[PDB]
Description:
By secondary structure, this protein is α+β, with helices and mostly antiparallel strands. The protein has eleven helices and ten strands. It has helices at 10-25, 32-43, 45-53, 78-81, 94-111, 114-131, 134-137, 146-158, 174-177, 185-207, 214-244, and strands spanning 257-264, 275-282, 287-291, 304-310, 321-329, 337-338, 340-347, 350-356, 361-362, 365-368. The strands form three sheets. Strands 4-1-7-8 form a four-stranded antiparallel β-sheet, with helices on one face. It has a four-stranded antiparallel β-sheet with strand order 3-2-5-10, with no helix packed on it. It has a two-stranded antiparallel sheet with strand order 6-9. Helix 1 (10-25) crosses helix 11 and helix 5 runs antiparallel to helix 6. The chain is globular and about 65 Å long. The structure holds calcium ion (2 copies) and zinc ion (3 copies). The site of one calcium ion has 5 residues, from loops. Residues 1-250 form the Zn-dependent PLC domain. It is an enzyme of class 3 (hydrolase). This is Phospholipase C. It holds the Pfam family Zn_dep_PLPC.
Amino acid sequence: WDGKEDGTGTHSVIVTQAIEMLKHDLSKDEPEAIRNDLSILEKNLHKFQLGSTFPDYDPNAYSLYQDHFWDPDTDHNFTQDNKWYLSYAVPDNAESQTRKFATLAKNEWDKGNYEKAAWYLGQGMHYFGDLNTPYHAANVTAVDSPGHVKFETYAEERKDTYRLDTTGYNTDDAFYKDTLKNDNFNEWSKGYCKYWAKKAKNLYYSHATMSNSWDDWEYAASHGVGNAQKGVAGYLYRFLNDVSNKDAVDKDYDLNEIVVMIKTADVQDAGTDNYIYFGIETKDGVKEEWALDNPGNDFTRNQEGTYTLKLKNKNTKYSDIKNMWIRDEKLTVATDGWKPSYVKVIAGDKVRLEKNINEWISGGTTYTLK
Length: 370
Ligand SMILES: [Ca+2]
Ligand SMILES: [Ca+2]
Ligand SMILES: [Zn+2]
Ligand SMILES: [Zn+2]
Ligand SMILES: [Zn+2]
């Protein structure tokens, strides 16, 4: 959907209206902690709105915004499904970005930086809103259709007439309780995004094509914007339970992947063209190393990049890991330097590591994280 950098437009209306819906839907039996925590989110509504539009204006965005797309039936974005775009392939998609940002936001909340929590959470709800956008869930780019941008502008012009006051439910009903029943957050999130994205893909094929009428577009756009609002209301419910519930027993799951986020500092010579690797060693001594390389540039000055690393072993839990590292390999004998600001690591439902670095790393060295 459309948005503007100042935190307005369709994406902002969606998340803002979603807050109003949750307030209305909160049942008389809900604990005070959920209400209180929602109020903290309301106090930082501005940062939440800004988050909700930011990814369209992130200076580290990929050239084609391919992470804003997600086809629920293939589990891929268009650069992995469409033959013309295979050399832009990137594992990151709108489903995966939703939970990256939800997980990031929980960690900020645990630390008490509610402003940043709300900014991160708004970014997560941006991607979630995109997977509710028919063109995005059908993997149809702005390039493949002039109708794509046209459809989002149409939606934008009418966004205020799409505002819902409620889901149709209170938080005692299955709509909201379903979001709580699976302790595996990543699995629930993927499953919940699958439900909404498939609805949006159906809406593309049935109603939002370039050979559909104007009445068909109003339908696709009002259901689409409405679905996003509903979906966000539920997502927020689960989020607010995850950060407020002290008595919830915490679970552990085998990792399919590790998400590694790195920012390179904004000083002279901070960047590098060296090969950069992330690595782990389990307790049994098994070793896995990945190259950090999305297509296009990596580790240029001031650049934030996210690297999703698929595990070769399937019976690995985070607590099996003994060592982590970043390794810097240089092509040539000539001395060079890289200054990373930070590394964050996500595995499962949690940010496992946040390490401020701000120290130079020579090529041919290894930096130890754990
Ligand atoms: Ca350098
Ligand atoms: Ca690259
Ligand atoms: Zn959008
Ligand atoms: Zn779009
Ligand atoms: Zn987007």
